[PDB]
């Protein structure tokens, strides 16, 4: 079995490189963040532009949805995060305290916490309702590329240019686990598997790895794409066949069989580094987005 993703829409309108795309948990919306300092909301099924959300003074590197699809959190080069009420577009909070670029962000499943990582080498845990920083973790010795909560919000995984992935206890803020590899290439992305038992980690040696973090064992590797320069996010695709999905610096979307590690499809049509991909939570739909030469978002659909 192989997927047959086909281009359905190309969404133009960001005036600089796109940095991330995320589907709302309820499946209704796609959100995109850009170096052009904007967030844009699009209809997930018809591609229709919904609205522009603005207020960051510098470009945005990441955006994330609350579990109830009502809020967005964005991370900016202006060293802040912002919490936005989606239906109004109003900024609800500005999260202040990082001393350098904010690179990555996520809500916990309860959506009372936001986790963030920054070029200042720290991971911060923020109270959503007050906007107050609850904890500053001295997580890494170089910029933090990714932060992600597990299924119940009791753990955080972080990754850094320093070459490490770390598993943190959310309530105590203590490091429970450090994944150390020889040759320690920079880690450009990490996230928990849907069941929270594994982590998917990208390194800037053109390599994705599926790890048992409790066992400290690497179960799968995925290769064939190009990832040497940029923090490209990867996804678990679970609505049809079980795939691994990632952008690539050769302008393609790559799709691997999760179990066999074979490449099952390559999506062509972007004209620059595909910096971000996202998988729709209920339909076999992929959103992809690209850097300065392209600046577009593409929606793809498959029967499996």
């Amino acid at each position: 079995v192989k997927p047959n993703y086909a281009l359905k829409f190309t969404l133009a309108g960001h005036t600089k490189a796109v940095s991330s795309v995320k589907f709302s948990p309820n499946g209704e919306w796609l959100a995109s963040s850009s170096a052009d300092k904007l967030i844009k909301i699009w209809g997930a099924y018809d591609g229709k532009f919904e609205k522009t959300i603005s207020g960051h003074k510098l470009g945005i590197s990441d955006v994330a949805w609350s579990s109830d699809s009502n809020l967005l959190v964005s991370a900016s080069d202006d060293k802040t995060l912002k919490i936005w009420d989606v239906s109004s577009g109003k900024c609800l909070k500005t999260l202040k305290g990082h001393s350098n670029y904010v690179f990555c962000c996520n809500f916990n499943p309860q959506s009372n916490l936001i986790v963030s990582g920054s070029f200042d080498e720290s991971v911060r845990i923020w109270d959503v309702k007050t906007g107050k920083c609850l904890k500053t973790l001295p997580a890494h010795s170089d910029p933090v590329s990714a932060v992600h909560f597990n299924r119940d919000g009791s753990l955080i995984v972080s990754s850094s240019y320093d070459g490490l992935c770390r598993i943190w206890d959310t309530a105590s803020g203590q490091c429970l686990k450090t994944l150390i590899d020889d040759d320690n290439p920079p880690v450009s992305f990490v996230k928990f598997s849907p069941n929270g038992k594994y982590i998917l980690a990208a390194t800037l040696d053109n390599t994705l790895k599926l790890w048992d973090y409790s066992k400290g064992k690497c179960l799968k590797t995925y290769t064939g794409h190009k990832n040497e320069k940029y923090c490209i996010f990867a996804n678990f695709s679970v609505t049809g066949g079980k795939w691994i999905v990632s952008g690539s610096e050769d302008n393609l979307v790559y799709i691997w069989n999760l179990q066999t590690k074979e490449i099952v499809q390559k999506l062509q049509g972007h004209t620059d580094v595909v910096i971000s991909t996202a998988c729709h939570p209920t339909e076999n739909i992929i959103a992809s987005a690209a850097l300065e030469n392209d600046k577009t978002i593409k929606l793809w659909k498959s029967d499996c």
Binding site: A35, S61, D77, P143, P186, S188, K229, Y230
Partner: peptide, 10 residues
């Protein structure tokens, strides 16, 4: 720009 859209390095 944004740091995500630039090469990843300190």
């Amino acid at each position: 720009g944004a740091a995500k859209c630039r090469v990843f390095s300190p």
